[PDB]
Amino acid sequence: MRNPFERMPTVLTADELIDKAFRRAEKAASSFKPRGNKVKKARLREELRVRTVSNVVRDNLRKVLERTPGLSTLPKFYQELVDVLVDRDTFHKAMAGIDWAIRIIRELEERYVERIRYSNDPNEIAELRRQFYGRVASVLRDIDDRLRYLNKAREVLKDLPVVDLEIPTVVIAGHPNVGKSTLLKALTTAKPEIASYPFTTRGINVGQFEDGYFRYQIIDTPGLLDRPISERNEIEKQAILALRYLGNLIIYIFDPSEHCGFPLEEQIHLFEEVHGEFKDLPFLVVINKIDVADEENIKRLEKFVKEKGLNPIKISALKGTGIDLVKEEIIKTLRPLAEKVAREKIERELRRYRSY
Numbered sequence: 001m002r003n004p005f006e007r008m009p010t011v012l013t014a015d016e017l018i019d020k021a022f023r024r025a026e027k028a029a030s031s032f033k034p035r036g037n038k039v040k041k042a043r044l045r046e047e048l049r050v051r052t053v054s055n056v057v058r059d060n061l062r063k064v065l066e067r068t069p070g071l072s073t074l075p076k077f078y079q080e081l082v083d084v085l086v087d088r089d090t091f092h093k094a095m096a097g098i099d100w101a102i103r104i105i106r107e108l109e110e111r112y113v114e115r116i117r118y119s120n121d122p123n124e125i126a127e128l129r130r131q132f133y134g135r136v137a138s139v140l141r142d143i144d145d146r147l148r149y150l151n152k153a154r155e156v157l158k159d160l161p162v163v164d165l166e167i168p169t170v171v172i173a174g175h176p177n178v179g180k181s182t183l184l185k186a187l188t189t190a191k192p193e194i195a196s197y198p199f200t201t202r203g204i205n206v207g208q209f210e211d212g213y214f215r216y217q218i219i220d221t222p223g224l225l226d227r228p229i230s231e232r233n234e235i236e237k238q239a240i241l242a243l244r245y246l247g248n249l250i251i252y253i254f255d256p257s258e259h260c261g262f263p264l265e266e267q268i269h270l271f272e273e274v275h276g277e278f279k280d281l282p283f284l285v286v287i288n289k290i291d292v293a294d295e296e297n298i299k300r301l302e303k304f305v306k307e308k309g310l311n312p313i314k315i316s317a318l319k320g321t322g323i324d325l326v327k328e329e330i331i332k333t334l335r336p337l338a339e340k341v342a343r344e345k346i347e348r349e350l351r352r353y354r355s356y
């Protein structure tokens with residue numbers, strides 16, 4: 001796993017590119033040894049300048065288009081968060097402005113080299129190089145705002161959540177203090193890590209537990225699935241709903257004791273709002289805090305739960321009571337997807353091990 005944009009280079013501003021290009025053209029012209037006639041020598045120098053400016057600009061710009069992943073090549077989850085962080089449509093257009101600039105400059109180069117190559121009026125030969133420089137600087141200034149934006153989008157994109165996008169992932173939801181992280185830590189092997197996540201205070205915990213030779217990713221959702229989604233901006237809402245493309249199973253934890261600081265009825269409302277936003281992912285309801293919970297509420301919960309067609313698992317994340325029942329259930333739910341993912345990995349590769 002990694003950040004898809006780590007390879008995206010710093011984008012030079014229109015001025016920096018202009019200066020780099022003119023400077024390089026200046027250097028190449030003085031150390032060039034023209035051929036014969038006085039006018040022929042100036043003409044071959046001016047041609048060299050036009051080509052050097054054209055190449056230096058096109059090479060730097062083209063590097064941006066080549067080293068930045070095409071958004072369509074990214075997993076849906078990242079496409080969603082990329083859009084949240086810098087706006088997908090704006091990104092595509094900025095990039096297209098770069099491609100446009102590369103294209104017009106190539107055309108201008110071919111156009112001006114011909115005019116110069118075909119001239120015999122020193123006055124004109126000079127004026128033509130001067131015009132080309134003028135036009136190159138102008139084309140680059142036309143996209144300067146786009147370049148500046150691409151450089152800022154570059155810095156912002158460094159905060160993409162660093163998580164595994166291939167292996168099955170379990171997403172833990174529920175109100176604050178219901179035991180989400182306690183459960184994630186009881187579930188994972190190595191210590192949890194922290195992934196950055198748009199619209200969260202301190203990010204989210206990311207863990208992993210291995211069964212056989214298969215890996216299962218576990219994440220919790222503080223600041224994301226611990227409060228009414230409706231009471232949210234359409235953007236942070238998009239950031240939250242992006243989890244649809246990462247999660248393969250959602251574990252929803254209820255705290256019947258209400259020690260979390262939320263009445264059972266409020267936890268049920270949240271469960272229903274979350275259960276509805278993720279209709280295409282399987283759910284595993286866990287009733288936590290059984291070690292301190294009152295039988296009274298637990299009856300209402302199981303009742304309510306079973307009425308939604310779900311068979312809950314009673315547990316105590318703190319004391320380990322039932323954790324193995326959860327791990328077991330995770331494995332039973334996700335092992336097939338894990339095998340399918342594994343196969344498809346051997347597939348994709350076999351298809352390029354025979355490159356040609």
Ligand SMILES: Nc1nc2c(ncn2[C@@H]2O[C@H](COP(=O)(O)OP(=O)(O)O)[C@@H](O)[C@H]2O)c(=O)[nH]1
Pocket residue numbers: 174175176177178179180181182183220222288289290291292315316317318319
């Ligand atoms: N009595 C009891 N307390 C628990 C249990 N699980 C977690 N807690 C405590 O409840 C509080 C919140 O748990 P936490 O994992 O931080 O909740 P999150 O905000 O949903 O991640 C903590 O102080 C945990 O120690 C449990 O099974 N029984």
